[PDB]
Amino acid sequence: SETPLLDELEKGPWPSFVKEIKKTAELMEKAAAEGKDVKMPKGARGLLKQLEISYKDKKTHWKHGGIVSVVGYGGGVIGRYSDLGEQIPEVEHFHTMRINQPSGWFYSTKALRGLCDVWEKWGSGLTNFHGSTGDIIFLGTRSEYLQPCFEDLGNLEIPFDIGGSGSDLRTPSACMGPALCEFACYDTLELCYDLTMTYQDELHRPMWPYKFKIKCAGCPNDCVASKARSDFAIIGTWKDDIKVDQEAVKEYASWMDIENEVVKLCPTGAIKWDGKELTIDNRECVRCMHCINKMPKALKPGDERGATILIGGKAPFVEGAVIGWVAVPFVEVEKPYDEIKEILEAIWDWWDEEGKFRERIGELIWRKGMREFLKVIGREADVRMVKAPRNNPFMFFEKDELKPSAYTEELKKRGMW
Amino acid sequence: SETPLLDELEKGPWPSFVKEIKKTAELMEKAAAEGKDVKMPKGARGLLKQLEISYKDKKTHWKHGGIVSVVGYGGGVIGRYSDLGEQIPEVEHFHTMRINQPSGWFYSTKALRGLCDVWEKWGSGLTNFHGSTGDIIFLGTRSEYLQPCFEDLGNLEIPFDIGGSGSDLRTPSACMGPALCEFACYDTLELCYDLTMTYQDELHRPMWPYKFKIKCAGCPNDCVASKARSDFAIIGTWKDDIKVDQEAVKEYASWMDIENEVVKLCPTGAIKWDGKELTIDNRECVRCMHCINKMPKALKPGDERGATILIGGKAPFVEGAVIGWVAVPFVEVEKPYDEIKEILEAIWDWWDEEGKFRERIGELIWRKGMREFLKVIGREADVRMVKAPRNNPFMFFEKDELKPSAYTEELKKRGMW
Amino acid sequence: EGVKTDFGPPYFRDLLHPVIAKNYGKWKYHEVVKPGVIKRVAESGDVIYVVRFGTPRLLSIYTVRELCDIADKYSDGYLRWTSRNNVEFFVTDESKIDDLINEVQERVGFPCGGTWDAVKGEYGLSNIVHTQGWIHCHTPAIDASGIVKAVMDELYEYFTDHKLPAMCRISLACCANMCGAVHASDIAIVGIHRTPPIPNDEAIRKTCEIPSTVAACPTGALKPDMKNKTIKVDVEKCMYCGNCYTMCPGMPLFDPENDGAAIMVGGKLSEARRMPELSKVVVPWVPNEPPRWPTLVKYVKQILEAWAANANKHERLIEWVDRIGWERFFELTGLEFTQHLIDDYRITPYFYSEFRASTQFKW
Amino acid sequence: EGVKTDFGPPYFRDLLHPVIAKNYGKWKYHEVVKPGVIKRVAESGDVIYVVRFGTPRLLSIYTVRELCDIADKYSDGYLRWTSRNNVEFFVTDESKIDDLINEVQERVGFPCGGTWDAVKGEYGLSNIVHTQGWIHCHTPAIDASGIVKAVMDELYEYFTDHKLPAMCRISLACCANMCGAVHASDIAIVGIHRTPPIPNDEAIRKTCEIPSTVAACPTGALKPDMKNKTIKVDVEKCMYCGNCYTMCPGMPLFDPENDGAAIMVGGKLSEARRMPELSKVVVPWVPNEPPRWPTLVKYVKQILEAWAANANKHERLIEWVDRIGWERFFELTGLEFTQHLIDDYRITPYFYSEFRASTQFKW
Ligand code: SRM
């Protein structure tokens, strides 16, 4: 075999990424011999080869990239160059094009085929369904093909635009939300779409200190992992009683251990069951879902719905990994979402003014204080923002809180206040 | 009234400090007219007058002091001056002398009547019983009286030496322990005195980057607040089974609600009670003491006894308030405590050589890493030092844990090893 | 005319199944029928079957087509992916569900599974979220696709059935950048380096902007060297994070003998039961041993087996440690605690520990 | 010849009661009799009654001679103070327990209390551990002995009886130096400034060590002027800790009008039932009002009384909070939550949150 190490990973029950690469080379190469117009017939076969050499070396053979893009945009394409390009010229340039996915990754077969027709003409044939931000990954093409590839995408019966990369608003994503799910507290797919469209300029033309990501989750289970992988996590919640079908409960009681599997596991004792009737104190509840999760035919999120905004989620660099924290306890989520847009635009203005090179929004707030962040978004301090008050007394006071004094007087006559 | 504001504070049921200051001056001035050798009768009156101005002004009237001390010692006396030194002549100098307490603040009546006579002679007559670190506080004397005072103190029938201040070892202190407490896991009083004696030079002659405190608790009730108020807190514990008298527990259960006050309130549910027998799972117990506190007639500490050492407890400055963390999960406490002394001396040697000006030990460990601290005291890392393993993958590796490689050879070749 | 731009993705409502578009936002309940199969019942009476299959994430365009022929046959031309890169089909005829599952299994070799059921309390292991590795990335410490495949091979039986007592997510990052929720997984495989950079002065002078390269080091280990207009590294402060190489081609730190993976555990995203949590390191390092990474795979299976054998229903890994303590964790997983596992990452502030990183709060 | 030095305190073992002396390290059981009285039984069998009284901490040498006289009559010549500055008495004559109490308040005016009975779960409130204030300290924002006078006064009947549901400690500190057990008490009063320092250039040149004063400031607000040679201060960066004034006499920050106390809550030292906790701000500032501090006393007592009123047997203030949460703590205490209470102290490392600051762990 040409690939003895990777051939090992065609064995075994789990579907093999190696067979996908080989299937692409076989069938791309076979498309080209038949005189179909395919620009990169050897690319998936150079990728395999380079990858086998990487397996033997236990190291990457990709080197830092030049900047590359389509006409009129500043991000969406990651330039990638092989260090093996003379030995394997078909992968000398092998850039990725991120293609913005439909909200919650819903497709019709007509939409997928146009994508497959476009990528087969201009690229390697390899794709990721999906990149971790959410985009479709068009993996591997040359610089000269990026522009005509994008022109074909925009001209398709069902057209697709480029997603984000670099110091921009990244491609927003959303959980399935109300398309499939009975726990959804707002229209996740509609909001995602609307944000994508409102801020096309922000996404396509990086202008900011660094990247900014938004993800929308329908409910607190967070099935898009927003609090950890977006700076601005929008997470469905509710303000009023959990809705209880009491008949449906007894149907559950006839077989489920409700005491142990439900009652006992509520974080706050919110929910007592006495053999004939189920009670929720909703004032104790914290909407952690679990009981709803446990009894979906009987229990439902309350009627007065909205979102909680958690701020600052990010991977570690530089100042450490972040699960985002409470910025806005409750905001309403209805089209055209002006309250959310208002909050976003304020954050962006402040961040573009005060942020350092490569400073994330979470880091800027750690540096400036939540007091300044809250003044920026026009909201007040709220106990739900913290998990405990401060364990030290080194507090800053606003000038206007201090008593008028001889000392406040000397501070002005010394020009320091 | 000579003192309108301070007089309000002789009213009320709680014992008045303002009474105590008046009681002093009246009597010291009464003694001085009778020809008793009272070098400072005016002192207590000075203090009262100074204090009344302070109460009116709502600011201190003590200024920064030049350094002062006895001969042969570098610490023990806090130099204090008044900014009303001309208006009030008898508080221009008003230094405190810290006077080492017997272990556990145990006194006989002679021991006390001696201190009383020396201080009436050379000082204001005002004291503190006791200071936070534990020393007896002789409040307000003059620069010239310091030395004669010290000579007389030592020349007492029951003689007292000066305690610690500055960048030294401070006066160690200890709970009542086996003098009164049936919970004592080791003899706190002996250890305290032995420690005070062994390191007399370190207490009297400050040589270190900053202060260092030791406090000794009989058991994990931490009755001298050692984990918060000492850098090196030696807290009693045990390795074997909590001892349990079954018939005493039935005496308890005829009147005590053991289920709700003991069983339910256990941090790890190690304790159980079915009505005829109590059962303790010592594998589960974290020796938090609660059950023992609730049932002193029935439950005792186990028989394999020693202590746990918590390191680094301190007030905020500079890097934050600290409750000490697990340094040595178990150490034996028996005279002459050479395993403990071994630790202490290893810590100081390192701290004196590495520490910055005014750097506490907990802040040195924060700066240098627990690994380095551990190497110094010759101990292994142990899961019991953390509440959780680290939340990030940014680990340091020793050179010798690395596999020899072309890369490590390159490192060696360049002198980066 | 000019080229079209700024038009965004296709509007999702036009790519929804008519029965999905109709009942949008008007569901009664969902019921997990068997591994891989979720029945969804609308207010109107409509019943739809969501059938879920695992994929290698990296798909041939020929594979996506075949998935297209299948969706035309069984789901009226409609399909979706989940946020773990499963793929999902919608079947209105319950009689054709097993026909579908068997046709995908045959034509593309994807397996039906990846679901869990909180109602009964029985959980499958779903797909592993992961990155490019050696396939596309310039900064990896480990491969992602090779390792996911090696691990999925060993734990296959947990994807096609509901045999675990709680959710368990497994995620992989090929370097400390993460590129996923890998820092908040029940088990996380994270690529690390264990060697400092060797500054290449020619490359630094040519291509690196010095002040931002220096500011990217979390430990202050880098200083400008004005004399030779380069950067000097203090090796005693470096912990091989790699962030300086992301910024600067002249700071490589890769060593194929000493690069490898840390194994972290105990993250949680969801709020149910217990607040969300960052994962924690329990195995400092395992080497890269392509194509099958036996050492890494063995430790992953060892941690999974130990939790699954001692976990009560609904008690995920961090919840299990919540109950047993870390001393027992290390004992029962047969893992060693060493000084490496003691946090020394200084730059992160204590005050973050006091911010509510959770949607759990009372009104 | 020269003074005897390096001789240490007098051997404690020699300053002991005969009954304490014999039975040392050998007791069967303790047993709170009423408030203030403590029975102890030895393995031997001999009985002791440890009797506890309020001390104003600060004492006259004459209130000590008098203490001695009492003590020779009742406690064979022995006595002691405790870790909170109460004074314990040693009758073994079990009828002289209650002539004493009288003859101890008749004389010096100390009341018997400061006790608690975990066994019956009834509790008193002991002494406030405080510092020095305007009496001797030269950096106090508040006056220790004075506010402690007031506060005790207004709460005197918690001292003299077993009125509370669990243990509560009150403690004080004159400035952010936080002398004593203020960083870890159930209720804590801490002097703060709210004004930055105005530099006295005349007094910095003649006195201060500029490089160290500068390097003493936690937020790095101070910067060495080289003119001029003095210190300047970025006011935007100053949180009025007063540390620069400890280093250097030319940096007063005192403003009689804006100095005050902050009130913190929910610290814990013992391990019983739940792990140690550092105290937390709930009130940013209350004014100095000598002589009575009515604003300070009002808030303090309002806080405890809302915790008395709601707490369960053994449920400490931190433990009540663990049960209700911070959202309800603020409602029941009537306090508001403002931005001052969100932590912004940058310097403390997050990794401290992951160290075991407690003696609770499994073998
Ligand atoms: C389809 C997908 C959303 C999407 O747009 O794709 C999804 C769909 C549902 N999720 Fe989810 N979840 C999905 C991602 C997640 C993720 C995000 C991730 O893992 O990266 C999580 C957070 C992971 C974590 O918490 O650390 C997530 C945490 C949950 C929770 C919490 C589990 C808990 O015990 O803590 C529920 C509750 C449950 O088990 O019913 C849940 C429940 C559900 C329910 C049952 C909702 C409903 O009422 O229909 C859906 C069926 C899931 C099932 O298999 O039982 N979903 N869910 C996601 C499928 C992933 C997959 O292929 O496995």
Ligand code: SRM
């Ligand atoms: C007299 C004194 C010892 C000494 O050497 O000076 C003392 C003596 C006892 N303490 Fe203590 N504790 C003494 C300081 C402390 C303090 C430290 C402090 O506040 O300065 C606390 C730690 C506070 C904290 O945790 O924040 C302390 C934490 C305890 C615990 C805690 C109860 C809990 O639920 O947390 C026990 C339990 C109990 O029996 O209630 C305790 C119990 C005891 C016992 C019952 C031990 C015994 O077996 O006899 C002693 C009887 C006192 C009583 O009232 O019940 N002692 N004890 C202490 C002097 C203080 C005073 O005058 O009131």
Ligand code: SRM
């Ligand atoms: C030297 C100075 C202030 C100064 O700059 O002049 C000082 C320094 C300080 C300063 C430190 C400094 O300025 O060097 C602070 C900041 C400590 C820190 O590192 O954050 C401080 C933490 C404490 C602490 C916290 C424990 C700790 O830090 O581990 C304690 C508690 C303890 O030791 O149990 C404490 C116990 C006293 N501290 Fe303190 N303390 C002073 C008073 C006291 C005493 C004497 C007041 C009192 O009677 O309550 C306390 C002890 C009497 C005794 O010797 O028994 C004090 C002046 C003496 C005076 O009254 O003129 N100080 N004092």
Ligand code: SRM
């Ligand atoms: C450009 C670079 C490599 C580098 O170190 O300079 C990169 C940078 C980075 C780096 C470093 C940087 O930004 O310079 C980090 C660290 C940022 C930080 O503040 O710590 C990073 C955090 C993520 C994160 C965590 C959230 C966050 O941003 O922190 C996510 C998760 C998310 O977006 O949902 C993420 C999602 C991908 N990240 Fe990422 N990521 C790269 C790939 C990816 C994608 C393509 C990997 C994948 O297999 O899916 C993921 C996005 C494709 C998509 O459009 O959907 C990537 C190159 C791949 C290539 O050349 O082919 N990266 N990527």
Ligand code: SF4
């Ligand atoms: S985040 Fe909530 S609404 Fe969304 S798919 Fe998950 S459970 Fe459904």
Ligand code: SF4
């Ligand atoms: S959502 Fe959580 S806190 Fe609310 S009652 Fe249900 S299970 Fe409990």
Ligand code: SF4
């Ligand atoms: S720490 Fe333990 S041994 Fe010491 S007095 Fe307190 S309860 Fe007794």
Ligand code: SF4
């Ligand atoms: S000492 Fe604490 S952990 Fe141990 S059995 Fe008693 S109550 Fe439980």
Ligand code: SF4
């Ligand atoms: S985790 Fe690291 S190696 Fe993997 S894609 Fe992201 S940046 Fe590249």
Ligand code: SF4
């Ligand atoms: S590898 Fe990380 S720690 Fe080391 S010099 Fe580079 S950025 Fe700094």
Ligand code: SF4
């Ligand atoms: S807390 Fe501050 S003002 Fe009070 S005695 Fe201590 S150092 Fe002085």
Ligand code: SF4
């Ligand atoms: S008062 Fe504190 S924060 Fe302000 S300048 Fe002085 S040391 Fe710095």
